[PDB]
């Protein structure tokens, strides 16, 4: 398994053309705020291809 290539599964809004997002901030996927901490409906945005 080569897991070195990652894609942004989760983001709040669509990018501009020729816009790059390398910010590794947490995403809030539910009503509960995450406060930078993983948990219920709190996921890392970058997931690797298997």
């Amino acid at each position: 398994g080569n897991y070195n290539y990652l894609y942004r599964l989760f983001r709040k809004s669509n990018l501009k053309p020729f816009e790059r997002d390398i910010s590794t901030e947490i995403y809030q996927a539910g009503s509960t705020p995450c406060n930078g901490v993983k948990g219920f409906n709190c996921y890392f945005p970058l997931q690797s291809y298997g």
């Binding site: 539910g30 509960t32 409906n41």
Partner: protein
């Protein structure tokens, strides 16, 4: 019901509030495979099998 005789409920002819179901913290697993959880309140379907 048991899993060999799983109960099938047909959800139709009604308006469905998926935000209450999605914002509930009692659910330990909420995984969608064909749609988005944040677009359930925007899309329309003919009927739902539960």
């Amino acid at each position: 019901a048991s899993v060999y005789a799983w109960n099938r409920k047909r959800i139709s002819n009604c308006v469905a509030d998926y935000s209450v179901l999605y914002n509930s913290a009692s659910f330990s697993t909420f995984k969608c495979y064909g749609v988005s959880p944040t677009k359930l309140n925007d899309l329309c379907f003919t009927n739902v099998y539960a």
